């Protein structure tokens, strides 16, 4: 008969539109209370820290987060910058290149990514 496929429907439709959705919702609310929940979008999860440290352990990605990464010979760059600043230093100015860069790198933003203290 044209029916006889409803034997499959009477099991599949209740299953996949009631049992599977209910199990999925229960599993989702259970997953919501894991410490790993939404670790890719929610800040301050343990797995995020472990993944970042794992990336940092790779020899290629050691100095990857540094915005100044790339200077093949930073000593040459610093020496050239110091020489160029010496010829342009205003009168009896007492600022050197080294401490100027050191104090231009050190800013005061305590409340930046402070969420790296729980997980």
């Amino acid at each position: 008969k044209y029916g006889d496929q409803r034997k499959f429907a009477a099991v599949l439709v209740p299953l996949t539109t009631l049992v599977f959705p209910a199990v999925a919702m229960g599993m989702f609310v259970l997953y919501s209370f894991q410490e790993d929940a939404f670790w890719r979008i929610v800040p301050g999860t343990k797995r995020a820290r472990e993944l970042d440290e794992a990336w940092r352990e790779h020899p290629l990605f050691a100095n990857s987060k540094d915005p100044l990464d790339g200077l093949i010979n930073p000593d040459d760059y610093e020496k050239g910058l110091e020489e160029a600043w010496e010829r342009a230093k205003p009168a009896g100015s007492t600022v050197t290149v080294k401490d100027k860069l050191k104090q231009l790198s050190k800013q005061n933003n305590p409340h930046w990514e402070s969420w790296r203290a729980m997980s």
């Binding site: 979008i41 929610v42 800040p43 933003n109 305590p110 409340h111 930046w112 402070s114 969420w115």
Partner: protein, 86 residues
């Protein structure tokens, strides 16, 4: 927690400090303006984000800028009353 940054264009109005409803901002001595003072945000963990400080700032573009971070909200940045997160 949000991010409240103070820029050099500050002229020491103190209006931003007075407008803050949770004592996030404060006045610190400085030497970059005739008022010899600039604002500071030492307690942005209490910054709800009302942006009243930005409303009160009279510089051409705000010397104080509040950057909203919604995936960062804490109980203080949300103003939770019925519920404690501590």
């Amino acid at each position: 927690s949000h991010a409240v940054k103070i820029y050099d264009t500050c002229i020491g109005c103190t209006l931003c400090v007075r407008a803050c409803p949770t004592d996030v901002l404060e006045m610190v001595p400085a030497s970059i303006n005739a008022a010899k003072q600039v604002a500071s945000s030492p307690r942005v963990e209490d910054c709800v984000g009302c942006k009243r400080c930005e409303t009160a700032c009279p510089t051409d573009f705000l010397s104080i800028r509040v950057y909203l971070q919604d995936n960062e909200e804490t109980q203080y940045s949300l103003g939770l009353d019925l519920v404690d997160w501590s």
